[PDB]
């Protein structure tokens, strides 16, 4: 064929350290004072963001 | 006096930062300092600082 694969850039080799908050990473937002995890859930037809209690 | 973290952000072994909030627990008393609401008769508008939970 004659297709060209344009190679964009998303992250450098130096920025891939696991000791850093990297773009695209996945984390949970724990609340220290209330000791609860931030959550978003479907409640009554509309999604709502809240702090779940356990 | 032990300096202890009133906030959950700071834990034992961390370095204190000016402007934060802490708790002062005497070594022997084991009860944090408390600013009671008992006004002193001698001087008006002055409360009392006592070691208690």
């Amino acid at each position: 064929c004659n297709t060209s694969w344009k190679i964009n850039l998303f992250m450098q080799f130096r920025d891939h350290l696991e000791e850093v908050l990297k773009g695209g990473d996945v984390v949970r937002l724990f609340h220290a004072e209330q000791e609860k995890f931030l959550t978003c859930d479907e409640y009554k037809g509309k999604l709502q963001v809240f702090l779940r209690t356990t | 006096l032990f300096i202890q973290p009133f906030w959950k952000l700071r834990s034992n072994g961390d370095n204190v930062v000016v402007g934060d909030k802490v708790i002062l627990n005497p070594v022997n008393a084991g009860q944090p300092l408390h600013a009671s609401n008992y006004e002193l008769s001698d001087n008006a508008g002055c409360k009392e600082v006592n070691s208690v939970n």
Binding site: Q48 | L9, V17
Partner: peptide
């Protein structure tokens, strides 16, 4: 309700709006 708070958090499908940008500030030095 504006309660003491003026705005409340909510989930929005689109992400190209300027209402979804958040800055992170540190708690220590």
């Amino acid at each position: 309700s504006y309660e003491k708070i003026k705005y409340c958090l909510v989930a929005v499908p689109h992400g190209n709006d300027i209402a979804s940008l958040f800055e992170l500030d540190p708690t220590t030095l």
